[PDB]
Design a protein around this ligand. Structure first.
Ligand SMILES: NC(=O)c1ccc[n+]([C@@H]2O[C@H](COP(=O)([O-])OP(=O)(O)OC[C@H]3O[C@@H](n4cnc5c(N)ncnc54)[C@H](OP(=O)(O)O)[C@@H]3O)[C@@H](O)[C@H]2O)c1
Ligand SMILES: NC(=O)c1ccc[n+]([C@@H]2O[C@H](COP(=O)([O-])OP(=O)(O)OC[C@H]3O[C@@H](n4cnc5c(N)ncnc54)[C@H](OP(=O)(O)O)[C@@H]3O)[C@@H](O)[C@H]2O)c1
Ligand SMILES: CCN(CC)C(=O)Cc1cccc(NS(=O)(=O)c2cccc(Cl)c2C)n1
Lengths: 263, 263
């Protein structure tokens, strides 16, 4: 069970923090007395956030700005950021490439770019951060979407990348348990959330309800802090049990007794 | 209810065809009297697949050698093979890059290559193949795994890439149902198969048993020709119902309705 002080003094990277969910993640961590390095492309907007973060109780608040389409920038960024903070407790992977909701028409360069931005970078950031996460016994929050467990018409490129996140990071969870690595990995499954970029992108296309950016941020923090395997905030109490696949839990358990562990 | 004559003088691409499951697919389409174009990297092991499909009943059998790590080659490939056969009915996407069995501990290169070979290429070949298949009302077989539905330790980069296929090709399908695009996409989820590569790699590590190549290939052909959404060949009768996910199924449908189709 959660208390705010499980974040006070903790060092933390929020990505996609220049607006929406990511912006609020950063704010609440700052009400908690956390140190943050926040990141995104748009410098102005990032200063606007560090400043408010300091105005609300963060221990420190720096920003670094760059495109995550850029793997060296991902690598380097992680290092500056640890160095700024004396290390790292929790890595919040929250950014994404912007996509319109249309039928797919052959746009390969879109499938590719969305794969870089929403999957490859997550893994590099993760790989750069791992030494300090290991020493800290810390945590990585992998922000994803109902569209990373099922599929909606209009976002094939997006969903491919979010599906890949489950597959890669879930396997990483399971290796870490077996090897007694105490870096937790919380896959965060978000129903629609009322960010401007997602109101603007769905008006007159998707009709379902939208849950609030502020709580969505918070719940991400909470489930990451509690070392939850998964954190569903999809606007319902029932629906997580229809997205989370008991079939798969059962299968993963059984299948594990089919390895020669000793070897 | 399937029959072999449904492939009589059908024009089929087979990737990953120089051995393994994909050779065995080619060999079976030959007995049935299809036109086949097979690709892989290895020119010698392809000249051997073609003589054999010739001596078997192939209406026609050709090869192109080339690496599916190169997307110009995937693209040109599909046009070279379409000119040859005078059309395209079925596109079978079977190649993959197998990696080192190992705990993940930083190897991004692999994570990049696996995604190139296994996923991106299935996309480029598909987009390139699309007009010939809209014009035949033909079929794609995307060949994946158990470890594209659930995770398994020691293979995260490959899992990521099989999962992505699920999210991209399952979205594209549902987009075809809507636009009444009459091209079917069959996801093939297969457990272990006794190709040398799988067994050699798992020798000593994974102790569960492996179903045969020969009928794995056949089942693939069958479920793709019967234009099925999924096809399971996983060593038991009950396992498909643990992997194929009634939670997801149900949400895929109920959400068809929260969209504004007029727009
Ligand atoms: N909103 C929803 O309904 C919803 C639902 C499910 C999942 N999610 C997920 O939640 C995460 C955040 O969603 P959101 O609604 O907050 O998005 P959003 O409000 O548009 O904000 C996304 C943030 O990520 C950043 N980002 C975009 N491109 C970037 C790039 N190339 N490099 C670095 N950062 C980039 C943006 O800043 P810059 O543009 O300045 O770089 C912005 O900071 C995403 O992972 C998304 O998939 C959202
Ligand atoms: N066998 C199993 O246990 C099992 C279980 C589940 C899923 N599957 C799946 O089934 C499919 C086939 O499995 P497998 O055991 O048959 O494969 P295999 O015996 O490893 O066959 C791999 C084929 O793909 C080719 N290939 C590898 N890299 C290539 C590249 N860069 N360009 C072109 N071709 C490349 C190979 O020829 P070259 O080296 O000459 O190019 C070879 O023909 C895969 O998609 C896999 O994920 C297999
Ligand atoms: C879709 C990419 N994007 C900007 C377009 C993001 O901001 C990410 C995003 C926006 C909206 C929803 C979403 N994921 S989601 O909730 O599973 C989703 C995706 C598509 C449709 C719907 Cl209704 C829902 C709920 N992800």
């Amino acid at each position: 069970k959660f208390r705010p002080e499980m974040l006070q003094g903790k060092k933390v990277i929020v990505t996609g923090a220049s607006k929406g969910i990511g912006r609020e993640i950063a704010y609440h961590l700052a009400k908690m007395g956390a140190h943050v390095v926040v990141t995104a492309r748009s410098k102005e907007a990032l200063q606007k956030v560090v400043a408010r973060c300091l105005e609300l109780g963060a221990a420190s608040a720096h920003y670094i700005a760059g495109s995550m389409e850029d793997m060296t920038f991902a690598e380097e960024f992680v290092a500056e950021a640890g160095n700024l903070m004396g290390g790292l407790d929790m890595l919040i992977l929250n950014h994404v490439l912007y996509n319109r909701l249309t039928f797919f028409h052959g746009e390969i360069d879109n499938v590719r770019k969305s794969m870089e931005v929403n999957f490859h970078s997550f893994v590099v950031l993760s790989v750069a951060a791992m030494p300090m996460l290991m020493q800290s016994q810390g945590s990585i929050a992998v922000v994803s979407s109902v569209a990373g467990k099922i599929t909606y018409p209009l976002i094939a490129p997006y969903s491919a990348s979010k599906f890949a996140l489950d597959g890669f990071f879930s396997t990483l969870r399971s290796e870490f348990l077996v090897n007694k690595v105490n870096v937790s990995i919380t896959l965060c499954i978000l129903g629609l959330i009322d960010t401007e970029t997602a109101i603007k992108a769905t008006s007159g296309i998707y009709l379902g309800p939208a849950s609030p950016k502020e709580e969505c941020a918070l719940e991400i923090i909470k489930g990451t802090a509690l070392r939850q395997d998964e954190m569903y905030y999809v606007g319902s109490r029932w629906v997580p049990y229809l997205l989370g696949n008991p079939g798969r839990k059962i299968m993963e358990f059984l299948s594990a007794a089919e390895y020669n562990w000793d070897n």
